Amino acid sequence: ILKCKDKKFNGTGPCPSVSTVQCTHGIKPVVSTQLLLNGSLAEEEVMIRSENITNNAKNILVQFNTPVQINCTRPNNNTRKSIRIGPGQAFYATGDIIGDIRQAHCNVSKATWNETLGKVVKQLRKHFGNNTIIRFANSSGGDLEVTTHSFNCGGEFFYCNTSGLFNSTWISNTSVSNDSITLPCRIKQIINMWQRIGQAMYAPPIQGVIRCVSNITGLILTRDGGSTNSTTETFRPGGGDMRDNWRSELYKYKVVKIEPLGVAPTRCKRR
Amino acid sequence: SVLTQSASVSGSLGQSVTISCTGPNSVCCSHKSISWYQWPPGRAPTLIIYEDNERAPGISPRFSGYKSYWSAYLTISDLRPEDETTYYCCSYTHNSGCVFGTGTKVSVLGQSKANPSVTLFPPSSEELQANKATLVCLISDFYPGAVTVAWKADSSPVKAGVETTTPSKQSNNKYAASSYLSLTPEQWKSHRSYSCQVTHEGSTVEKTVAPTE
Amino acid sequence: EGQLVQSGAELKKPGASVKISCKTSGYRFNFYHINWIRQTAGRGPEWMGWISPYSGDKNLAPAFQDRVIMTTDTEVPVTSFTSTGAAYMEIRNLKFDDTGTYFCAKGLLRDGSSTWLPYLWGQGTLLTVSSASTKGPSVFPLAPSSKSTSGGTAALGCLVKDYFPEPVTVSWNSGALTSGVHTFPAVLQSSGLYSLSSVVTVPSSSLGTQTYICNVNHKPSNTKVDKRVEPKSCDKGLEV
Amino acid sequence: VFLGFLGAAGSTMGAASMTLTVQARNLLSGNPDWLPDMTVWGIKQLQARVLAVERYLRDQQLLGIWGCSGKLICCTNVPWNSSWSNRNLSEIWDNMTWLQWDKEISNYTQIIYGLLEESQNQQEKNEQDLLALD
Amino acid sequence: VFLGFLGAAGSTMGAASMTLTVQARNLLSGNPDWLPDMTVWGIKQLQARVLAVERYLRDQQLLGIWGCSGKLICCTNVPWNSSWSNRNLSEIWDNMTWLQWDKEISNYTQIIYGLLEESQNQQEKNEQDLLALD
Amino acid sequence: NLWVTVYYGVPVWKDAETTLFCASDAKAYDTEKHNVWATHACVPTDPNPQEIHLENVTEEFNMWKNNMVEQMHTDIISLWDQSLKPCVKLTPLCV
Numbered sequence A: 001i002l003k004c005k006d007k008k009f010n011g012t013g014p015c016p017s018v019s020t021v022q023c024t025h026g027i028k029p030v031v032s033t034q035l036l037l038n039g040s041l042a043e044e045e046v047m048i049r050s051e052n053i054t055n056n057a058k059n060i061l062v063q064f065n066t067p068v069q070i071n072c073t074r075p076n077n078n079t080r081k082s083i084r085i086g087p088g089q090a091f092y093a094t095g096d097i098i099g100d101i102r103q104a105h106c107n108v109s110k111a112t113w114n115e116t117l118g119k120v121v122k123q124l125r126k127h128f129g130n131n132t133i134i135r136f137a138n139s140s141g142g143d144l145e146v147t148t149h150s151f152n153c154g155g156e157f158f159y160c161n162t163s164g165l166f167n168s169t170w171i172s173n174t175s176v177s178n179d180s181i182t183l184p185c186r187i188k189q190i191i192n193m194w195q196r197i198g199q200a201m202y203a204p205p206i207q208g209v210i211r212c213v214s215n216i217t218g219l220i221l222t223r224d225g226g227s228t229n230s231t232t233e234t235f236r237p238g239g240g241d242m243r244d245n246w247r248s249e250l251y252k253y254k255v256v257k258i259e260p261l262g263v264a265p266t267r268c269k270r271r
Numbered sequence B: 001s002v003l004t005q006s007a008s009v010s011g012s013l014g015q016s017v018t019i020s021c022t023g024p025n026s027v028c029c030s031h032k033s034i035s036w037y038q039w040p041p042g043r044a045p046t047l048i049i050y051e052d053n054e055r056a057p058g059i060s061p062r063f064s065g066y067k068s069y070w071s072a073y074l075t076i077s078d079l080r081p082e083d084e085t086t087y088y089c090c091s092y093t094h095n096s097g098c099v100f101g102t103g104t105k106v107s108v109l110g111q112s113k114a115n116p117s118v119t120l121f122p123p124s125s126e127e128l129q130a131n132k133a134t135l136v137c138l139i140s141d142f143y144p145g146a147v148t149v150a151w152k153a154d155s156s157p158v159k160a161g162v163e164t165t166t167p168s169k170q171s172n173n174k175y176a177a178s179s180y181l182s183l184t185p186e187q188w189k190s191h192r193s194y195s196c197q198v199t200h201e202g203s204t205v206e207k208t209v210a211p212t213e
Numbered sequence C: 001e002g003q004l005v006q007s008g009a010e011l012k013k014p015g016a017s018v019k020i021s022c023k024t025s026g027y028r029f030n031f032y033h034i035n036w037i038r039q040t041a042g043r044g045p046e047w048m049g050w051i052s053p054y055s056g057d058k059n060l061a062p063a064f065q066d067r068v069i070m071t072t073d074t075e076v077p078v079t080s081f082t083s084t085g086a087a088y089m090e091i092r093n094l095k096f097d098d099t100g101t102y103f104c105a106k107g108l109l110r111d112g113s114s115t116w117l118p119y120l121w122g123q124g125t126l127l128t129v130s131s132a133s134t135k136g137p138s139v140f141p142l143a144p145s146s147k148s149t150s151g152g153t154a155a156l157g158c159l160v161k162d163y164f165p166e167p168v169t170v171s172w173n174s175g176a177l178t179s180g181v182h183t184f185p186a187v188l189q190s191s192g193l194y195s196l197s198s199v200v201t202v203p204s205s206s207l208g209t210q211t212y213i214c215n216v217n218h219k220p221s222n223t224k225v226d227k228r229v230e231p232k233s234c235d236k237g238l239e240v
Numbered sequence D, E: 001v002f003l004g005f006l007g008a009a010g011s012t013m014g015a016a017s018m019t020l021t022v023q024a025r026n027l028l029s030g031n032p033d034w035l036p037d038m039t040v041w042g043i044k045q046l047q048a049r050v051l052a053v054e055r056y057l058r059d060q061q062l063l064g065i066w067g068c069s070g071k072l073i074c075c076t077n078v079p080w081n082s083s084w085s086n087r088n089l090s091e092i093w094d095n096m097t098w099l100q101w102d103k104e105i106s107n108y109t110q111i112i113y114g115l116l117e118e119s120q121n122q123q124e125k126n127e128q129d130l131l132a133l134d
Numbered sequence F: 001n002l003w004v005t006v007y008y009g010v011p012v013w014k015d016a017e018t019t020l021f022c023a024s025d026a027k028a029y030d031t032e033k034h035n036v037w038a039t040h041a042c043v044p045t046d047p048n049p050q051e052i053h054l055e056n057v058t059e060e061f062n063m064w065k066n067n068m069v070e071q072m073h074t075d076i077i078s079l080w081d082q083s084l085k086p087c088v089k090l091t092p093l094c095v
C-alpha cells in the first residue's frame, strides 16, 4: 500500500513523497451526510477535491484543517420496555418520557464556524476567481437522508437540518455575537438506508439522556448548474453516495502488486 | 590552464588523428579521470569521452581514448567533414569540478573546395536620409579559412572605416564572413565606382557598384 | 528526451548584475547535477560550477566563489518520470572579461566516478558587458541577384545594420520559409557596432505565386521590423 | 545501504541490486492468524493469500524452467540483443531504476521469457544428456 | 517439435523428452480470477486449486529429498536393475511411450522411490559431511 | 560480451486491485461489547506499523478511480446484513 505524504495533494496527480505500509492508518467507519464526522484532518491547508470541478453534478469533497466542534444532545430522559413476543424474541419499546420534553439538537460554536467558512471561501476562490462572490444556501430537496445531516450517536439516529448554517454571501474581505448556533434535529428509529430494499432496521431505544461530542472535518457540496459565470456560484450541501464518505480517508492510499522478476544484461558465463 | 594540449592540429579525409592532453604532476593523469568535449564555438557542445576511454552513448566508435602515466590522448578514426571543429579535454575526480585544457583546433582537409559567393550591396534611400553610407560585402561558401578584403573607392584604396569580420563556419560545413565600409555622403557623391575585392588563395572575387546606378 | 531551455539575451553595465534562467523538461530535475560553464574570448571556456537540486550541494570554482550565486527551484512532476524544474544563476561584479555565451547542462550519472559531468547542454545565452547604450537596428531589403542563369534562381534577403546590443534572430514569412534561408554573422565596427545580413535562394519563376516577407525581432531593444523584398530584379544576368 | 522494504525503488539498479533479499523476505509471509472462526469474511482474505502463493509459485516455475534456479542473482547463456535497450553498460546500472527499465523492456519483454525457456533448457538439458556419458 | 501442450503423449520417450518445459508450465498456473464474492461455489473450486499446490509440492518434496533438485532432466547414482524392464537402450527411447513405460514399471515402481530417498541422500549427504573437511 | 541475467526481488510494482485485510486495533478484547463493527473477524494490529518512505519516488495517484473505496463500501454493507441477520425480526409489528 503506497501512502502519499506531501501536505498539499490534489487527489489526482503524482505524489512526489511516497511511503509504503501493509496496514493503513486507523479509519473510523462513520455513516454521515452533509458533514464528515470524526475524520482525518488535512495538513496545513483546506483541500477542495473533486472528480471534475467544471462538471456540476460531481460532488465537491472538502477536508478541514481545524476541527469544527459540534455537540449533539437527545434531552429526553427516556426509558424502555421489554415486552415479550414469541417463544424467544423480545421487543424493546420506547417507554413514557420521564421529565420534560424538547427537541434534540446539535450545537456548533458560531466563531469557529465563521472562521472555518472564512478559510474555506479563500480555497474555493482559487478555482472560481480572485475577488468574486460565492453563496451557499440550504439543501434543495428530495430524500430525507440527502437533505439532512444524518448520523448516529449512542444508538439513536439524528436527522438534523443544517439550514441554520448555510446563509452566506462573501465579499472579498468579509461576509454579509450569538455565542453558538443551534440546529433543530429530528430522530428516526426505522431506517431504509439499506441498498437492499428488502430489509429495514429498527433502532432500540436508549434508556437515559444522550450527549455526544464530535469533530467536524469535511463537507459534501453541489454547485448550482447553468450559466452562472458572470454572476455568483452556489454550493448547496448534498451527499447520498456512501463512497464519498470514504474518499476523504482513502485518497492517499493505492494498492500495488509486486512483480519481483527482472532481467538485465551483465557480463558472465555459465559452464 | 596548466592542462596543456596540442597547439594546432590538421588532418586528412578518412584517416586517423591524435590529440594530446597533459599537465604537471598536480593535475596529472596518473590517478585522475579524463574527459573529452566536442566544442562547436558558439553552439551546443557534446560529451564524447568520459572518465576514461569509455565513450558517451550514441558516439560512433570512430573516437577512442588512452591514458598514459603522463598524458592522455584522443584518437579519431575515419575523419569526417563535420569533425572540423575545436575540441577540449577535462581532468577531474569524483568530487572535484572540471579543469579545461588549452584547446586543440581540428581541420580535416582532402575535401572538395568551395568556390566563394561574394555579393556587394550599397546603402538604400533610407540611409541616404540618415546621412551615412555603408557598403555591404557578404562572403559565404568558401573552404579555406583565410580571406583578405580590400576596399577601393574609384579603384583607390581605403583605410578608414574599413572593417572586416572573422571566418565563421557555415552549418553546411563551409565557411562564411563579411566586411563593411563606412563612408560619408560627401565621399559617397564624389566617386564613380566602388569595389570590394576578396583575394582567395586560388582566385579573387571583385564586385563593383556605383552611386549613379 | 531532456529538452532544456535557458534564458533570453540581456544587456548590462560593468559592475552591475544579471540573472540567467535554466528551465528544464522531459526528465527528472532532481536526479542530476546542473553544471554551469561559460565561453569568453579572453580566456576561453571556464567551468563555473555545478549544483545538486536533490541534496542542495553546490561546488564553484575558487575564482567564482564570491560573484556567482546558483539557485534551483523544486521540481514540478508531470508524470512519474518527468519533472519541470528550474535553475537560476545570478552573477555580480560584471567586468569586461565576463562577456560571452553561457551554458547550463545536465549531470551525467546518478552514481559512479563521473556523476556531474555535463551531457545535455542548453542552447546558450550570450552576454555583453558594456557601458554603451541600447540602439535599435536599421533594416533594409536586398535587391535580387542572379545565381544560375540557365537554372533560373534569384537571391534576395534583408539587411540589419548598426545595433549595439545582443544579436537578432530573423524568420521568413512568419517562419513559413526555411529552405534556402542562409544567415550571415555580425560585424564589429570601430565604434562598437554590430551588423549582419540574411538571404534566401528563391526560384526566379516564384514571383507571382509566393510572397517573401522577412521578420526581424530585436529582443533587448524590444523592436520588430517586417520588410517586404521587392520582386523587381536588377542583375543583368537575371533579367534575361 | 538497507533502508528497509522497497527502500531502493528510485535508486540505481546497481544499488537496488544490493537489496534483493529484503524485497523477497516480505512478499511471501505477511502471515495473518485466522484462528477465529468467522464465516463469510475469511473466504475473501483466504482466497487472497491462496492466490498469493499461486502467483508466487508461477514465478518459481518460471525461475525453474530456466537454467537459473537459485533464488538469487543468476546468469544465463542467452546473449543480450542490441535492439533491446540500445545502451552501453553503466548507463543502465548507474542512471536507471528498475521501474523505468521494465518500462523500456515492456515492448520487448514477452519474447525474452521464451528465449530463456526454449533456447536454453530445451537444448542445454538435451546437450547435458548428450555430453555426460563420456 | 513443439505441438503444444501434451503434444507428445504418443511419441517416443526421447521425442517427448524434448517437450518437458511445456507440460510443466501449464500444470501449476491455470489461474482463475476469483475477485467476485460468491458464497458457496468458491469453496469447491478453491479447495481444488489448493489441493493442486498440495499435490504439486508433494512432487517437489520427492524432487527435493533426492539428489535431483533441478526442475529439469537429472541424473542420479542408483544403478538400473535388469529385473526392471528387461530391455536394452534405444528399444525404450525410440519404441515406447511414457504411458506404456509407467505401465511396465508400475509393478516395480514403488521401491524405486525408496531406493532414491534412502540409498542416496541418507548416505550421499552423510558422505558429503564426512568428505568435505579436507 | 553481455548476457541476460534474471534478478529475483527487484522493487517493481504494477497497480492492481485485490482483496485487502482489516485490523482489530488490539483493544478489542477489552471492549467486550460482544460485537462492534468489525471486531468480529479482524486480526490484531502489528506492534510497529512498517512505514517506510521511498526516496526519489513519484507515484501517480487517483483517488476517484480507486478500488479500495469499493472494497470498504462492500465491506460495510456486508457488515450491516451479517450484524442484523441473527437479531429479532419485527414483522408482526406491521399492525
Ligand SMILES: *[C@@H]1O[C@H](CO)[C@@H](O[C@@H]2O[C@H](CO)[C@@H](O[C@@H]3O[C@H](CO[C@H]4O[C@H](CO[C@H]5O[C@H](CO)[C@@H](O)[C@H](O)[C@@H]5O)[C@@H](O)[C@H](O[C@H]5O[C@H](CO)[C@@H](O)[C@H](O)[C@@H]5O)[C@@H]4O)[C@@H](O)[C@H](O[C@H]4O[C@H](CO)[C@@H](O)[C@H](O)[C@@H]4O)[C@@H]3O)[C@H](O)[C@H]2NC(C)=O)[C@H](O)[C@H]1NC(C)=O
Residues within 6 Å of the ligand: B094, B095, B096, C030, C031, C032, C033, C052, C053, C054, C055, C057, C058, C059, C060, C107, C109, C110, C111, C112, C113, C114, C115, D007, D008, D010, D011, D012, F055, F056
Ligand atoms: C536519489 O537521487 C539522487 C539524485 O539522483 C541521488 O543523489 C546522488 O547520490 C549519489 C550517490 O548515491 C551521488 O554520487 C556520489 O557523490 C559523492 C559525493 O562526493 C563526496 O565528497 C563531497 C565533498 O566535496 C568535497 O569538495 C568540495 C568542493 O566544493 C568541498 O566543498 C567539500 O568540503 C569536500 O572537500 C561530500 O560532500 C560527499 O559527502 C556525502 O554527504 C554529503 C552531504 O552534503 C552529500 O551531499 C553527498 O551526496 C555525500 O552523501 C562525498 O563524500 C561521491 O563521493 C561518490 O563517489 C562514490 O562512488 C564512487 C564510484 O566510482 C567511488 O569511487 C567513491 O569512492 C564513492 O564511493 C558518488 O559519486 C550523487 O552525487 C548524488 N547527486 C546527484 C546525482 O544529484 C540519491 O543518492 C538518491 N537516493 C536514493 C536513496 O536513491
Ligand SMILES: *[C@@H]1O[C@H](CO)[C@@H](O[C@@H]2O[C@H](CO)[C@@H](O[C@@H]3O[C@H](CO[C@H]4O[C@H](CO)[C@@H](O)[C@H](O[C@H]5O[C@H](CO)[C@@H](O)[C@H](O)[C@@H]5O)[C@@H]4O)[C@@H](O)[C@H](O[C@H]4O[C@H](CO)[C@@H](O)[C@H](O)[C@@H]4O)[C@@H]3O)[C@H](O)[C@H]2NC(C)=O)[C@H](O)[C@H]1NC(C)=O
Residues within 6 Å of the ligand: A163, A164, A165, A167
Ligand atoms: C438566513 O438568512 C437570513 C437573512 O440573511 C437570516 O435571517 C435574519 O435573522 C436576523 C436575526 O434574527 C433577523 O433580524 C431581526 O432583528 C430584529 C431586531 O433588530 C431591529 O430592531 C431593533 C430594535 O428592536 C433595532 O435596534 C434594529 O436596528 C434599528 O435601530 C438602529 C439603532 O441605531 C438603527 O441603526 C438601524 O438602522 C435600525 O433602524 C432593527 O431594526 C428583530 O426584531 C427580528 O425578529 C422579530 O421580527 C421578525 C420579523 O419582523 C420575526 O420573524 C421574529 O420572529 C421577531 O418577531 C429579527 O431578529 C432578520 O429579520 C432575519 N431575516 C429574515 C428575512 O427573517 C437567518 O438567520 C439565516 N438563517 C436562517 C436559519 O434562516
Ligand SMILES: *[C@@H]1O[C@H](CO)[C@@H](O[C@@H]2O[C@H](CO)[C@@H](O[C@@H]3O[C@H](CO[C@H]4O[C@H](CO)[C@@H](O)[C@H](O)[C@@H]4O)[C@@H](O)[C@H](O[C@H]4O[C@H](CO)[C@@H](O)[C@H](O)[C@@H]4O)[C@@H]3O)[C@H](O)[C@H]2NC(C)=O)[C@H](O)[C@H]1NC(C)=O
Residues within 6 Å of the ligand: A030, A037, A038, A151, A152, A153, A154, A155, A211, A212, A213, A214, A215
Ligand atoms: C465520534 O467520536 C466521539 C468521541 O469523542 C464519539 O463520542 C462518544 O460516543 C460514545 C458512544 O456513544 C460515548 O460513550 C458512551 O458513554 C455513555 C456515558 O458513560 C459515562 O460514564 C462513563 C463511565 O465513567 C464514561 O466513560 C463516559 O465518558 C460517560 O461519562 C455510556 O453509557 C455508553 O455505554 C456504552 O458502552 C457500554 C460499555 O460497557 C455499554 O455497556 C453500553 O450499553 C453502551 O453501549 C458509552 O460508553 C462517549 O461518551 C462519547 N464521547 C466521547 C468519548 O468524547 C462519537 O460517538 C463518535 N461518532 C460520531 C458520529 O460523532
Ligand SMILES: *[C@@H]1O[C@H](CO)[C@@H](O[C@@H]2O[C@H](CO)[C@@H](O[C@@H]3O[C@H](CO)[C@@H](O)[C@H](O[C@H]4O[C@H](CO)[C@@H](O)[C@H](O)[C@@H]4O)[C@@H]3O)[C@H](O)[C@H]2NC(C)=O)[C@H](O)[C@H]1NC(C)=O
Residues within 6 Å of the ligand: A138, A139, A140, A141, A147, A163
Ligand atoms: C431551506 O430554507 C427554506 C427557507 O429559506 C425552507 O423553506 C420553508 O420550509 C418550511 C418547511 O420547513 C415551509 O413551512 C411550511 O409552509 C407551508 C406552506 O408553504 C405550510 O403549509 C406548513 O405548515 C403546515 O404544516 C404545519 C405542521 O404542524 C401545520 O401546523 C400547518 O397547519 C400546515 O399544515 C409550513 O409552515 C416554508 O413555507 C418554506 N418557505 C419559506 C421561504 O419559509 C426550506 O424548507 C429549507 N429546506 C430546503 C430543503 O429547501
Ligand SMILES: *[C@@H]1O[C@H](CO)[C@@H](O[C@@H]2O[C@H](CO)[C@@H](O[C@@H]3O[C@H](CO)[C@@H](O)[C@H](O)[C@@H]3O)[C@H](O)[C@H]2NC(C)=O)[C@H](O)[C@H]1NC(C)=O
Residues within 6 Å of the ligand: A110, A111, A114, A173, A174, A175, A177, A178
Ligand atoms: C462572522 O464574520 C463576519 C466578518 O468578520 C462578521 O461581520 C461583521 O459583523 C459586525 C457586526 O454584525 C459588523 O460590525 C458592524 O458593521 C455595521 C456595518 O454597517 C456598522 O454599521 C456597525 O456599527 C458595526 O461596526 C462588521 O462590520 C462585520 N464585518 C467585519 C469584517 O467585522 C460577523 O459578525 C461574524 N459573525 C459572528 C461573529 O457571529
Ligand SMILES: *[C@@H]1O[C@H](CO)[C@@H](O)[C@H](O[C@@H]2O[C@H](CO)[C@@H](O)[C@H](O)[C@H]2NC(C)=O)[C@H]1NC(C)=O
Residues within 6 Å of the ligand: B057, B058, B059, B060, D082, D083, D086, D087, D088, D089, F001, F002
Ligand atoms: C555501445 O554504444 C554504442 C553507441 O551508442 C553502440 O553502437 C553499441 O551498440 C553496438 O555496438 C557494436 C560494436 O561491435 C556494433 O557492431 C553495433 O552495430 C552497435 N549497435 C547499434 C544498434 O548501433 C553499444 N554497445 C553495447 C555493447 O552496448
Ligand SMILES: *[C@@H]1O[C@H](CO)[C@@H](O[C@@H]2O[C@H](CO)[C@@H](O)[C@H](O)[C@H]2NC(C)=O)[C@H](O)[C@H]1NC(C)=O
Residues within 6 Å of the ligand: A010, A012, A013
Ligand atoms: C488537479 O487535478 C485536475 C484534474 O482535472 C487538474 O486539472 C486539469 O485537468 C485536465 C483534464 O480536464 C488534465 O488533462 C490536466 O492534466 C489537469 N491539470 C493538471 C496540471 O494536472 C488540476 O490542474 C489539478 N490541480 C489543481 C490545483 O486543481
Ligand SMILES: *[C@@H]1O[C@H](CO)[C@@H](O[C@@H]2O[C@H](CO)[C@@H](O)[C@H](O)[C@H]2NC(C)=O)[C@H](O)[C@H]1NC(C)=O
Residues within 6 Å of the ligand: A069, A070, A071, A107, A108, A109, A180, A213
Ligand atoms: C461542547 O461541549 C464541550 C464540553 O462540554 C465544551 O467544552 C467546554 O467549553 C466551555 C466554554 O468554553 C469551557 O469552559 C469548558 O472548559 C470546556 N470543557 C472542555 C472539556 O473542553 C464545548 O465548548 C462545547 N461546544 C459547543 C459548541 O457547545
Ligand SMILES: *[C@@H]1O[C@H](CO)[C@@H](O)[C@H](O)[C@H]1NC(C)=O
Residues within 6 Å of the ligand: A051, A052, A053, A054, A055
Ligand atoms: C468535466 O466536465 C466538463 C463538461 O462535461 C468537460 O468539458 C471536462 O472535460 C470534464 N473534465 C474532466 C476531467 O472530466
Ligand SMILES: *[C@@H]1O[C@H](CO)[C@@H](O)[C@H](O)[C@H]1NC(C)=O
Residues within 6 Å of the ligand: A122, A125, A129, A130, A131, A132, A172
Ligand atoms: C487572488 O490572488 C492574490 C495573489 O495571488 C491573492 O492575494 C488573493 O487573496 C486571491 N484572491 C482572493 C480574493 O483571495
Ligand SMILES: *[C@@H]1O[C@H](CO)[C@@H](O)[C@H](O)[C@H]1NC(C)=O
Residues within 6 Å of the ligand: A171, A172, A173
Ligand atoms: C479589501 O481590502 C483591501 C485593503 O484594504 C482593499 O484594497 C480592497 O479594495 C478591499 N476589497 C473589498 C471588496 O472591499
Ligand SMILES: *[C@@H]1O[C@H](CO)[C@@H](O)[C@H](O)[C@H]1NC(C)=O
Residues within 6 Å of the ligand: A038, A067, A213, A214, A215
Ligand atoms: C478532535 O481533534 C482534536 C485535535 O487533535 C483531538 O484532540 C480530539 O481528540 C479530536 N476528537 C475526536 C472525537 O476525534
Ligand SMILES: *[C@@H]1O[C@H](CO)[C@@H](O)[C@H](O)[C@H]1NC(C)=O
Residues within 6 Å of the ligand: B057, C001, C106, C107, C108, C109, C119, C120, D091, D095, D096, D100
Ligand atoms: C542517464 O544519463 C545519461 C547521460 O547523462 C543519459 O544519456 C541517459 O538518458 C540517462 N538515463 C536515463 C534513463 O535517462
Ligand SMILES: *[C@@H]1O[C@H](CO)[C@@H](O)[C@H](O)[C@H]1NC(C)=O
Residues within 6 Å of the ligand: D079, D080, D081, D082, D083
Ligand atoms: C534481436 O531481435 C531482433 C528482432 O526481435 C532479431 O531479428 C535479431 O535476430 C535479434 N538478435 C539477437 C542477437 O538476438
Ligand SMILES: *[C@@H]1O[C@H](CO)[C@@H](O)[C@H](O)[C@H]1NC(C)=O
Residues within 6 Å of the ligand: D107
Ligand atoms: C511498443 O509497442 C507498441 C505497439 O504498437 C508501439 O506502438 C510502440 O511504439 C512501442 N514502443 C516502443 C518504445 O518501441
Ligand SMILES: *[C@@H]1O[C@H](CO)[C@@H](O)[C@H](O)[C@H]1NC(C)=O
Residues within 6 Å of the ligand: E079, E080, E081, E082, E083
Ligand atoms: C534387482 O531387484 C531384485 C528384486 O527387487 C533384487 O533382489 C536385486 O538385488 C536388484 N538388483 C540390483 C542390481 O539392484
